[PDB]
Amino acid sequence: REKERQNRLAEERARREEEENRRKAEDEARKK
């Protein structure tokens, strides 16, 4: 159960991270 929880939280973190990455990408694109 602990590993399930930790992995779920970890994928949530990674998904938020890729959200911010594509976000900064589209920001730079607007700068272009």
Swiss-Prot record:
Protein name: Troponin T, cardiac muscle
Family label: Belongs to the troponin T family.
Range of the intact protein held here: 157 to 188 of 301
Bilayer-crossing regions: none
Disulfide-bond pairs as recorded: none
The species this protein was found in: Mus musculus (Mouse)
This protein's encoding gene: Tnnt2
Function per UniProt: Troponin T is the tropomyosin-binding subunit of troponin, the thin filament regulatory complex which confers calcium-sensitivity to striated muscle actomyosin ATPase activity.
Domain of life of the organism encoding this protein: Eukaryota
